[PDB]
Amino acid sequence: RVILLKDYMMREQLFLRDKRYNHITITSENDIVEAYETELNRQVEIKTNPIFRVKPLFYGINSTFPKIDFKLQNKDFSDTINCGFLMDNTTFEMTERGGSTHFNFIGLCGVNGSHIQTNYCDFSYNGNREQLEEYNKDQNMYGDGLRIFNSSLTGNYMTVNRCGEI
Amino acid sequence: RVILLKDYMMREQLFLRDKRYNHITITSENDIVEAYETELNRQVEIKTNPIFRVKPLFYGINSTFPKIDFKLQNKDFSDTINCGFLMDNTTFEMTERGGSTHFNFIGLCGVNGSHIQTNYCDFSYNGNREQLEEYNKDQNMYGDGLRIFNSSLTGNYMTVNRCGEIGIHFSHGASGYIDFTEARFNGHHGLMVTTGSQASARNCKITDTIDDNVVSYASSDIDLRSSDCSNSQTTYGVIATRSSNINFDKGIANGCGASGIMANRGCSIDATGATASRNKWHGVIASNNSKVDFTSGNANENGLDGIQCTHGSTVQARLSTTNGNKRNGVLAYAGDVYCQEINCDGNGRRGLEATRGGYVAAYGAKVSRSKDDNVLAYGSMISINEAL
Amino acid sequence: RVILLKDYMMREQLFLRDKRYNHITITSENDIVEAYETELNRQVEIKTNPIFRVKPLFYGINSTFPKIDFKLQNKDFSDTINCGFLMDNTTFEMTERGGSTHFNFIGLCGVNGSHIQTNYCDFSYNGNREQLEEYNKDQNMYGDGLRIFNSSLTGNYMTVNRCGEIGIHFSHGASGYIDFTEARFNGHHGLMVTTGSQASARNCKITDTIDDNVVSYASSDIDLRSSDCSNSQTTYGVIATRSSNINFDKGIANGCGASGIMANRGCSIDATGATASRNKWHGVIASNNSKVDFTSGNANENGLDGIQCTHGSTVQARLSTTNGNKRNGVLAYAGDVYCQEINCDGNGRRGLEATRGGYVAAYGAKVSRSKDDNVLAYGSMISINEAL
Amino acid sequence: RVILLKDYMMREQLFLRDKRYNHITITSENDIVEAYETELNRQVEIKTNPIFRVKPLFYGINSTFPKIDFKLQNKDFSDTINCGFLMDNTTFEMTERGGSTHFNFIGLCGVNGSHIQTNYCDFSYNGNREQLEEYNKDQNMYGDGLRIFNSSLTGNYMTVNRCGEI
Amino acid sequence: RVILLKDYMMREQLFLRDKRYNHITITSENDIVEAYETELNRQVEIKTNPIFRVKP
Amino acid sequence: RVILLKDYMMREQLFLRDKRYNHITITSENDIVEAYETELNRQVEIKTNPIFRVKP
């Protein structure tokens, strides 16, 4: 059990690859874990029919990811491609207590048969909804939430409000 | 870093007096924080040309204020002068995540030179708008969404909806930067810049306010490059008075309960590609020695004169389209009107017209199908060198 | 809290340089503090466009300054460049109880973006006013007060009397909020807003000042909603010039030394209810391509034309009552004048004149009892459609 | 009984706050006491519907003021704001031997429930009357005499000539 | 008083966020301080009518 | 200058009767001073056209 103290402010990216971390659980003394400007910008490029480069805070490829028991809430709006979670060929679970929020590009991305368990969670305000003007159907409308390609997802009672684009 | 838990409901006022707290940030787990009845009615009085007494939930004087990261919503409707934030000679900033809301008197104020940044914020319902009726210009309209007195503001993409009297208020030398914002359904003037102030409201949408949507008052300079100031319920859409300039470069002012664009008392407006259609009164009116530009605008279906002058005013419509108006189209009521190739069609009466010493210069006017004479000089001069 | 005992008489300079003394306050047991000759002469030179050097008793640079709670009165007259307060990039505040006085050069100065909050204070006799004769504009009027460059000032109900050259000086893109202020008997201009600055002086009072009382210069906007600017000596009362703006909504300009309300070289003035009477020269004058509004003003017993337009400028006097003058009631001099139902009576040389290419549009004029020729066109046009 | 000798010419303001001076009286051997320019330019301000400040030569707030047995004649014309007497919550009495005269702004001011008993006194020439032109309705009329706000006054046979405005 | 030696060539970005530093002053022995390519590039976006990203 | 400290919470009635306290001033460090139930409920009655009993 990894407990993030109330003094912890997220400023780095956690990259797990080929790690069978079924047992580990990540919990926070706070309800929300804020995410500030990451020191080192490590981006992962997704080779898919639309090519889009992402900078994820939590990234797991070809491996099970530790259970998440907090809510990521972005606090850096300078980077236009940051993303809360990029799960790639990964079974991913969240503990009903949180979900990514306020990220610029994508709240949570599931690729390559990455089953997601997020349930009762909240993925809101992710994207370009801050800038766009109401009642216009033709404008550059950026961002996205729960971008799921070729992956399963079991999430009920979620709330996803005010997200730019899908 | 201060975190307000979900179970925290605000019931006390936070007063900061000469405390520099740049580093401190106030955050809340909840999206919004509700301000209930305050334990002690501490009040701050502003000693200025208008003297007004305010009860602020947050207050700072001569001191940088901690960055705010939540949204204040008022749930105390018993009080009458309660306010969300009162900044006086402070550096106040918000984290694009919230703003004061539903307060009785004002949502935010600035008294001395105190720069304020409220980008992507929300200041809605702050005032008397709940009670007052629609299509009524004679009632008590109380409270402003924002108030900036001799201060600075940089708030873009704000939404200031259904405030009591004034959605956004700049006055007394305030230099404001409110851009792409949206302000609708305010009881009184939705945006007013008064008394030597200056604003910057490019691409800003302000509609449905009961009185004038945008007012530039007493030497204020305000820019509205492509704004949509229309659908005023009772009075004009865009108005400039008392020697104050506006730049309505491509504005849209339709459906107003009164004249779509007005320029009065020695002021200047620029509406090069404007649109003033379906207004109840004259589509474009300039009165008492005020200059307007209408180089390629339109004025259709207005209930009265499509484009009018009054007492020394000079409107310029080089290629405008003024057709379908209910009464007259172009009129020169003791004023000058210049129209290189104006188009008039299907008017209601009198077509292009001048009177009472007014002058009209229309080198290539194309007037047709009007119901009465298509042209008339009523004790005045008109210059139509080559018309159809 | 620094408390200056009754025994203290200032004889040294206080210089603060990058000190965040935001919390300190300076109070005096005595109401005012006398500043005698300083032991050490420290002079600071301001490297702006007009280069001047100053010996300030208080100097604060790049640093918040402690709040001042006392009044400085200078009892030293040997040094000709001394000053009370010099704030450069400083937020400066006073406690409605004090302000510099009797200083040789200037009372208070702000050079950088140094906000000042001198409110309800006093700044008097700061300069050479005691040693110059009256009714002589050709004097070396040294001194100044409230010299403000590229700053913001928030001071209401101030009183700036008998200053040397300028009672209140705003310049170089500086905001200002000098409201309800009174300035009297200042040598040279009593209030000036120069070079892009903006100000606010609603219900202010400038009277009995040699030269002009209120000056708008080089694209400067100022608001004078109901101010009384009169009794100036040998020069205009309110003057706008070099493309500036003024809102003289209901001002008073009576008994002025020469020509009352004056607009010149591109400016614009709005003076609807304004009174401009008993002046030695023209009551209201718009010269060299300006605009003046006089929708209901009065211009009586002026020694020259009550309303005067010159070289392309246009004035509008819809229902003005200009009667009893010494010379012509209304005059156009290659300029336009518009008067829907103007009233003239017992005028001087001419009831209403239009000469040298001018134009007068008086649809319902009621000029009468003129001493000579009543209404006259002198190589120009007039439109008195239904005169009486 | 304070007795002002003939050699004395007033040059300093007198301020009393919360003093119960019923017994003291001020008298002068000369009929008229001349008030020259004051060394200290102390001012008081009245915060009411019209906001105005003055430079009172005699000031008493929340206090009973000593009886006055002389006539104050101003001899300083540089200051355009000085007032002969400002009383606030003060019971003020004069013994018919004189009153303020020739002041630039005001001869006497009674504010804030004060009481004045000036009787047979002279309040003349205190204003702009020496400069303004006769038969002129529209000119700057400055000065005043006996400006009374929410106070009382009992004075008969007083001579108030050539005042500035009122 | 931070004094930059004449040898120093600026190859990093200095981000002083939210710090009151009136007293500090930065001086260089050389008149011109050359700024080469930053080893780590950090970009800040300004959110106004023109939204332009900058690398200061 | 009677200074009410921040810890003071009014719980008694102050009665003055023929006292000429011109100089004395009552000031509190707090902006406002709360008033709670009084230990002595002393009432004063005004004898005029409408008679009303007031606990001051």
Q: Closest partner residue to B173 among C22, C176, C340, by Cβ?
A: C176
Q: How far apart are CA C145 and CA B147, in angstroms?
A: 30
Question: In 10 A of CB D135, how many CB atoms?
Answer: 4
C-alpha distances (whole Å) from C345 to each of B132, C274, C300, C329 are 49, 19, 10, 8
Give E-chain residues touching C21 at CB under 8 angstroms: none
- Nearest residue in B to A102, CA atom: B97
Q: How far is D12 from chain F (nearest CA, A)?
A: 24
The count of residues in chain F is 56
The SS3 assignment for B90 reads coil
- Over its C-alpha atoms, chain B yields an Rg (Å, rounded) of 24
Q: Are B173 and C175 in contact (CB under 8 A)?
A: yes
Q: Is C63 on the interface with E (CB under 8 A)?
A: yes
Hunting for tokens 């800038």 — which residue is that? A131
With CB atoms and an 8 Å threshold, state whether C231 touches D53: no
Distance CA C226, CA A51 (A): 66
Residues of E in contact with C19 (CB under 8 A): 22
Q: Do C254 and D138 touch (CB under 8 A)?
A: yes
Distance from CA of D89 to the nearest CA of F (A): 11
Phi first, then psi, for residue B243 (nearest 5°) are 60, 45
Structural element, H or E, at residue B68: strand B67-74
- CA D78 – CA B368 distance, rounded (Å): 73
Contact residues on chain B for C26, CB-CB shorter than 8 A: none
Are the beta carbons of B113 and C115 closer than 8 angstroms?
yes
Residue B106: which of B140, B83, B79, B80 has the closest Cα?
Answer: B83
Task: Name which of A70, A74, A64 is nearest A145 in CA terms.
Answer: A74
Spatial separation of the C-alpha atoms in residues D137 and C169, rounded to whole Å: 32
Is B96 in Cβ contact with A133 (below 8 Å)? no
Three-state DSSP at C129 gives helix
Record: contact A131-E40, CB cut-off 8 A: no
Q: What is the largest CA-CA distance in chain D?
A: 48
- The string of DSSP letters for chain E reads -EEE-TT--B-S-----S---SS--EEESSS---B---SS---EEE-SSS-EEE--
**Distance between CA atoms of residues C316 and C376, nearest Å:** 19
User: What string of DSSP letters covers B114-180?
Assistant: --EE-TT-B--S-SSTTTPPSS-SSS----BS-EEES-EEEEES-B--S-SSBSEEEETT-EEEEES
Instruction: Give me the amino acid identity at A115.
Output: H
With an 8 Å CB cutoff and a minimum of 3 pairs, decide whether chains C and E touch: yes
Please tell me whether residue D46 adopts helix, strand or coil conformation.
strand
Contacts of B179 in chain E (CB under 8 A): 48-49
The answer to whether chain B touches chain A by having 3 or more C-beta pairs less than 8 angstroms apart is yes
**B172:C245 CB<8 A:** no
| Dihedrals phi, psi of E35, to nearest 5 degrees | -105, 110
Which B-chain residues 160-179 have CB contacts (< 8 A) with chain E?
Answer: 177, 179
Chains touching chain D, criterion 3+ CB pairs below 8 Å: C, F
Q: Assess contact for D145 and D106: CB atoms under 8 A.
A: yes
Find the length of chain A: 166
Closest partner CB to D140 (pick from C124, C180, C231): C231
SS3 state at A22: coil
Q: Across the strands, what pairs with B367?
A: B344
Contacts of F45 (CB under 8 A, 6+ apart): F51, F52, F53, F54
At D27, which helix (H) or strand (E)? Answer: strand D25-35
Whether C130 sits inside 8 A of D78 (CB atoms) is yes
Solving technique: cryo-EM
Q: Angle at Cα D69 formed by Cα D66 and Cα D74, nearest 5°?
A: 100
| CA distances for A51 relative to A45, A54, E14, angstroms | 8, 10, 33
Break-preceding residues in chain B (C–N over 2.5 Å)? none
> Residue C299 CA to chain centroid, in angstroms?
21
Are the CB atoms for B242 and B287 separated by under 8 Å? no
- DSSP per-residue letters across F39-51: SS---EEE-SSS-
In DSSP terms, which residues pair with C8 in a beta bridge?
Answer: none
C85 within 8 A of C61, measured Cβ to Cβ = no
List chain E residues with CB under 8 Å of B96.
47
CA angle, B385 as apex, B382 and B388 as ends, to 5°? 100
List Cβ neighbours of B295 (8 Å cut-off, separation of 6 or more): B272, B273, B316, B317, B318, B319, B320
- 3-state SS track over B241-268: ECCCEEECCCCECCCCCCCCEEEECCCE
Residues near F38 by beta carbon (within 8 Å), at least 6 away in sequence: F11, F12, F13, F55
Q: Which residues of chain B are within 8 Å of residue F31 when distances are taken between CB atoms?
A: 40, 42
Distance from CA of A111 to the nearest CA of B (A): 30
User: Contacts of residue D62 in chain F, CB cutoff 8 Å?
Assistant: 22
Query: To the nearest whole angstrom, how far is the Cα of C221 from the nearest Cα of chain E?
Result: 26
Q: Do chains A and E touch (3 or more CB pairs under 8 A)?
A: yes
* CB within 8 Å of chain B, chain A residues 122-161: 130-131, 133-134
What does B366-388 look like in DSSP terms, one character per residue? EEES-SS-SEEEESSEEE-SS--
User: Tokens 């179970």 belong to which residue?
Assistant: B7
User: Could you tell me if C86 and C54 are in contact, meaning their C-beta atoms sit under 8 angstroms apart?
Assistant: yes
CB < 8 Å to F32, chain B: 40-42
**Rounded distance between C-alpha atoms, residue A59 and residue A63, angstroms:** 10
Instruction: Give C-chain residues touching B198 at CB under 8 angstroms.
Output: 198
CA distances from B102 to B143, B266, D107 (A): 11, 38, 53
C253: Cβ–Cβ under 8 A, 6 or more apart, which residues?
C229, C230, C237, C238, C260, C261, C274, C275, C276, C279, C283
3-state SS class at C130: helix
Token pair belonging to C101:
């006085």
Q: What are phi and psi of C129, to 5 degrees?
A: -60, -30
CA atoms within a 13 Å half-sphere pointing along the CA-CB vector of A134: 12
SS3 C131: helix
Q: Is E49 close to B20, i.e. CB distance below 8 A?
A: no
Q: Is D84 exposed, middle or buried (0-12, 13-18, 19+ CB in 10 A)?
A: buried
Distance from CA of A155 to the nearest CA of E (A): 34
Question: Could you tell me the two tokens for D105?
Answer: 């702004």
Determine the residue among A131, A135, A162 to mutate to test chain B binding: the one whose Cβ has the most chain B Cβ atoms within 10 Å: A131
| Three-state SS at B103 | coil
Can you say how many angstroms the Cα of residue D104 is from the centroid of all Cα atoms in its chain? 10
Token look-up 């004002």 returns: B106
Count CB atoms within 10 A of the CB of residue A133: 14
- Identify the residue whose tokens are 């057709």: B323
Q: Nearest-CA distance from B133 to chain C in Å?
A: 31
Residues sharing a CB contact under 8 Å with residue C185, sequence separation 6 or more, in sequence order = C129, C161, C162, C207, C208, C209, D80
Name the strands in the sheet holding C359-361, side by side, starting at the edge strand that comes first in the sequence: C221-223, C245-247, C268-270, C291-293, C314-316, C336-338, C359-361, C381-383
CA distances from B46 to A38, B38, B114, C204 (A): 44, 20, 14, 19
Whether B40 and B68 have beta carbons less than 8 Å apart is answered as: no
Best residue of D138, D139, D165 to probe chain C, by most C CBs closer than 10 Å: D138
Residue D110: closest CA among D42, D36, D56: D56
Q: The tokens 């940044």 sit on which residue?
A: B117
Q: Do chains F and C touch (3 or more CB pairs under 8 A)?
A: no
* Nearest chain C CA: its distance from B292 CA (Å): 14
Residue C204: name the closest of C259, C165, C167, C151 by CA: C167
User: What is d(CA C40, CA C59) in angstroms, rounded to the nearest whole number?
Assistant: 14
Q: A109 vs A32, A76, F10, CA distance in Å? A: 20, 19, 62
Put simply, whether E1 touches C (Cβ < 8 Å) is: no
**C-beta separation of B288 from B313 below 8 A:** yes
Structure tokens at D112: 């804030």
What CA–CA distance (Å, rounded) separates B137 from B233?
9
Q: Which residues of E touch A79 (CB under 8 A)?
A: 43, 45
CA distance B224 to B357: 33
Tally C-beta pairs within 8 A across B and C: 157
C-chain residues within 8 Å CB-CB of D133?
255, 278
Residues in F 18-37 with any Cβ partner in B closer than 8 A: 31-32, 34
Chain C residue nearest residue E20, CA to CA: C20
DSSP C195: T
For chain E, the chains sharing at least 3 beta-carbon pairs closer than 8 angstroms are A, B, C
Cα separation, A26 vs A4, whole angstroms: 8
Contacts of C177 in chain B (CB under 8 A): 48, 149-150, 172-173
> CA B264 from chain center: how many Å?
16
End-to-end CA distance of chain E: 22
Close Cβ partners of D23 (under 8 Å, ≥ 6 residues apart): none
Q: Which residues of chain E make contact with C20, given a CB cutoff of 8 A?
A: 20, 22
List of residues 6+ apart from C50 with CB closer than 8 A: none
* Cβ <8 Å between B27 and A34: yes
DSSP, residue by residue, C38-50: -SS---EEE-SSS
C156, C199, C268 member nearest B266 (Cβ) = C268
Which of C102, C122, C255 lies at the smallest CB-CB distance from D139? C255
Task: Decide: C222 and C201 in contact? Cβ < 8 Å.
Answer: yes
Question: Within its chain, how far is the Cα of C65 from the centroid?
Answer: 29
CA atoms of C199 and B118, how far apart (whole Å): 25
Contact B265, B286 (CB under 8 A): no
What does the angle CA D69 – CA D73 – CA D74 come to, to the nearest 5 degrees? 140
